[PDB]
C-alpha cells in the first residue's frame, strides 16, 4: 500500500508532506475526510498527466467500496477521466462506475452527463438526443441538490448548438442560469455565455419575448461596453423598431449565424413592429390602417395582409382584417414587461376604477335602504 | 426512574457513515441507542423515547412513545446523507416535550453529536440559555471524533449546570475503535 | 365581509426566476355547504337573522350590494 506512494512522492514542493497526513486518515479506517481532499488533489498537477494511475489505489477501494458517497465517487471517478483520454475503454470504465452506483440520490445523473461528454465530438442525429431525453429523470427532482443540474443542462446546451435549432439553446440555456452557477463565473465565460444565448434569442421560431432576456440579471450585465451591438439589437427588437434594425447591420459584429439567417431575422423584428404598435394605441382606436402598418415595418401595401395572419397563426396578437376600407383591428397585445413608469400608470387607472366602483355602490345602498338587512 | 422522559438526538450526517469504531457509525449508533432506550426503560415502568434526525432540517422520525420496539425499527433506513444543524436541533426536541403525554415526566434529551460539528459559540449559549431556563437540561455525547476535547460545547453543557446546577455531563469516546458498550456510564449513573 | 374559507393546494414547477427549488400553492375554490342533518342544527343555533321573503329583496343585497 505504501509502496505507491514512495514512487510519486517525488511529484513537486509539499508533495510527500500530504501524502503522509493522508496515510494517516487511511489507519483510521474513515473516507469522508479523505475523500474532500481529493479534489483538491485534482487541481494540484499542472499537466494533470500522472494523476490517472491512482487508480490502482482506487481500484481496491473503489470496486468494492460501497461506502464512499458516490455523488463525490462520480465526482472523482469523472476527474480521472479527463486525461485519461482512450474512450473505447473509459466507456466501459464510465459503464463500470454506473453500475457500481444506484444510491437513493441517484449519482448516475452525473455518470450519464459523463457519457454525453465522451461523445461530444462525434454524433449528431441519434448519438445523444437518446441520451439526453432518457437522461430526464428529474421526475422525483427533489429541486435544491442543483448538483447535476448545472452539468445536464450544459450538455443540452451544447446538442441544440450542434443541431442548428436556436430555439430549444434558448429555452434549456437559459435554465443553466439561475440554476447552481450563482453567477461568478469566470468573467470571460460570463460575457462569452451571455453572447451565444442572446444571439439564439433573435433566431427562433417561439421566441418572442425579449422583455425577459434584455432585463436577464445575469447576461445582459457583464456586456456594458465591449460590443454592444448585440445588447443596442436587442433593445432593437424589443421596441419593435425596423428603422433601428436596418441602421445597425453594418454594426453586425460575428455576423456568420446570424446574417445568413438575413429574412429570419427581419420576420420576426417585422412582426414585432405590429405588435408594439397596438400596444402604444389607446384601446378605444386600435384601428391600425393598412398604410399604417406598412410604413412602420416597411412593406409594401399589398404584402401586409401576410404580416397580420402570420402575426395571428402564431397565437401571438388577436383581431379581424377587414380588406375594404383597409383596417386591421386588434383586440388582445400579449402582455410585455413594464419596468416601474407604466406600472405607475396602472396604479392611476385603478384609482380612477376603485373611485367610480366605490361611488356605485353607496348610490344603491342609499336609494335602496329599505331593501336591505 | 423519576418519571423520566428522553428524546433521543440521532446523527446522519454524511461524514458519520465511516467505520473508525467497528460497523460504522451507523450500527455503532444503533447499539448505541439498544444499550440506552432499554437502559432508559426498566427503570420506571413508565418511561419515554423519542427519536430525531439531525440531517438538513427537522427530521423526526418517532414521537413520545413508551414502546422500545418501534424506535429500534425506526432506527434502519437512516443512510446518513448531508450535513448536520445542530443550533437547529434541539429545539425541535425542545417543541416534543412541550407536547408531552401527561407532563408529570421529568424532562431529559440525550445528544448523539458526530460528524464535524458546527457551531458559532455565542449562539449556542443561547441555545443552552434557554433549555436551561424551563426545567430541562439536555445531554449531549461526544461522538465521531470531533475536533479534540469539542471545545465548543464545553462553553454549552456548562451553561446548563452552571451555578452549581448539576446534571447532565458531556461524554466523550477515545479516537481508536473504542466499543461504545457500557462507556456511557456519567449521566445513566447518577445524573 | 369575505368568505372565511380559503382552500389551496400544492402544484409544482420550477423555474430560473424565483428561486432553484420552487413549488407553490394554487387556489381552489371554497364554499361552505351544508347536510340534511347538519342544516337542521345550524338553522336552529341561529334563529337570529334570515332573509325571510327571499325574493327581489335578498338579490337587491345578497348579491348586488
Not at chain 1, 160 to 181: E, M, P, W
Request: aromatic share 6%.
Amino acid at each position: 500500500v505504501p509502496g505507491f506512494l514512495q514512487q510519486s512522492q517525488n511529484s513537486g514542493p509539499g508533495q510527500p508532506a500530504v501524502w503522509h497526513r493522508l496515510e494517516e486518515l487511511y489507519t483510521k479506517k474513515l473516507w469522508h475526510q479523505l475523500t474532500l481532499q481529493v479534489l483538491d488533489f485534482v487541481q494540484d498537477p499542472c499537466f494533470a498527466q500522472g494523476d490517472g494511475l491512482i487508480k490502482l489505489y482506487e481500484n481496491f477501494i473503489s470496486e468494492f467500496e460501497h461506502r464512499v458517497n458516490p455523488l463525490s465517487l462520480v465526482e472523482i471517478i469523472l476527474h480521472v477521466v479527463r486525461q485519461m483520454t482512450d474512450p473505447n475503454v473509459a466507456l466501459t470504465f464510465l459503464e463500470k462506475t454506473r453500475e457500481k452506483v444506484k444510491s437513493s440520490d441517484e449519482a448516475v445523473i452525473l455518470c450519464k452527463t459523463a457519457i454525453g461528454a465522451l461523445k461530444l465530438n462525434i454524433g449528431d442525429l441519434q448519438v445523444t438526443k437518446e441520451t439526453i431525453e432518457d437522461v430526464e429523470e428529474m421526475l422525483n427532482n427533489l429541486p435544491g441538490v442543483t448538483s447535476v443540474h448545472s452539468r445536464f443542462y450544459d450538455l443540452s446546451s451544447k446538442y441544440y448548438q450542434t443541431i442548428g435549432n436556436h430555439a430549444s439553446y434558448y429555452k434549456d440555456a437559459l435554465r443553466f442560469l439561475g440554476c447552481v452557477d450563482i453567477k461568478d463565473l469566470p468573467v470571460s465565460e460570463q460575457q462569452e455565455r451571455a453572447f451565444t444565448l442572446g444571439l439564439a434569442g433573435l433566431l427562433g421560431e417561439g421566441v418572442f419575448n425579449f422583455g425577459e432576456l434584455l432585463m436577464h440579471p445575469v447576461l445582459e450585465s457583464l456586456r456594458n461596453t465591449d460590443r454592444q451591438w448585440l445588447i443596442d439589437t436587442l433593445y432593437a427588437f424589443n421596441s419593435g423598431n425596423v428603422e433601428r434594425f436596418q441602421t445597425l447591420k453594418t454594426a453586425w459584429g460575428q455576423q456568420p449565424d446570424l446574417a445568413a439567417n438575413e429574412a429570419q431575422l427581419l420576420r420576426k423584428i417585422q412582426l414585432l413592429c405590429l405588435m408594439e404598435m397596438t400596444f402604444t394605441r389607446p384601446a378605444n382606436h386600435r384601428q391600425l390602417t393598412f398604410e399604417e402598418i406598412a410604413k412602420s415595418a416597411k412593406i409594401t401595401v399589398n404584402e401586409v395582409e401576410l404580416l397580420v395572419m402570420k402575426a395571428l397563426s402564431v397565437g401571438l396578437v388577436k383581431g379581424s382584417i377587414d380588406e375594404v376600407d383597409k383596417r386591421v383591428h386588434m383586440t388582445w397585445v400579449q402582455p410585455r414587461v413594464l419596468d416601474l413608469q407604466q406600472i405607475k400608470g396602472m396604479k392611476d387607472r385603478l384609482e380612477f376604477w376603485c373611485t367610480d366602483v366605490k361611488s356605485m355602490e353607496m348610490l344603491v345602498e342609499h336609494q335602496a335602504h329599505d331593501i336591505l338587512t | 426512574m423519576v418519571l423520566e422522559s428522553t428524546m433521543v438526538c440521532v446523527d446522519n450526517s454524511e461524514y458519520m457513515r465511516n467505520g473508525d469504531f467497528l460497523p460504522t457509525r451507523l450500527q455503532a449508533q444503533q447499539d448505541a441507542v439498544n444499550i440506552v432506550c432499554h437502559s432508559k426503560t426498566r427503570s420506571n415502568p413508565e418511561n419515554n423515547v423519542g427519536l430525531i434526525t439531525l440531517a438538513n432540517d427537522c427530521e423526526v422520525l418517532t414521537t413520545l412513545t413508551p414502546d422500545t420496539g418501534r424506535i429500534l425499527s425506526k432506527l434502519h433506513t437512516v443512510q446518513p446523507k448531508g450535513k448536520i444543524t445542530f443550533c437547529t436541533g434541539i429545539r425541535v426536541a425542545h417543541l416534543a416535550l412541550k407536547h408531552r403525554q401527561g407532563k408529570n415526566h421529568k424532562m431529559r434529551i440525550i445528544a448523539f453529536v458526530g460528524s464535524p460539528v458546527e457551531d458559532n459559540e455565542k449562539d449556542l449559549v443561547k441555545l443552552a440559555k434557554r433549555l436551561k431556563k424551563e426545567k430541562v437540561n439536555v445531554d449531549i455525547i461526544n461522538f465521531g471524533e470531533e475536533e479534540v476535547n469539542t471545545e465548543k460545547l464545553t462553553a454549552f453543557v456548562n451553561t446548563l449546570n452552571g451555578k452549581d446546577g448539576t446534571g447532565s455531563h458531556l461524554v466523550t469516546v477515545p479516537p481508536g475503535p473504542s466499543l461504545a458498550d457500557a462507556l456511557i456510564s456519567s449521566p445513566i449513573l447518577a445524573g | 365581509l369575505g368568505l372565511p374559507t380559503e382552500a389551496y393546494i400544492s402544484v409544482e414547477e420550477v423555474h430560473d426566476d424565483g428561486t432553484p427549488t420552487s413549488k407553490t400553492f394554487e387556489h381552489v375554490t371554497s364554499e361552505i355547504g351544508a347536510e340534511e342533518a347538519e342544516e337542521v342544527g345550524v338553522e336552529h343555533l341561529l334563529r337570529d337573522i334570515k332573509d325571510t321573503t327571499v325574493g327581489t329583496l335578498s338579490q337587491r343585497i345578497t348579491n348586488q350590494v
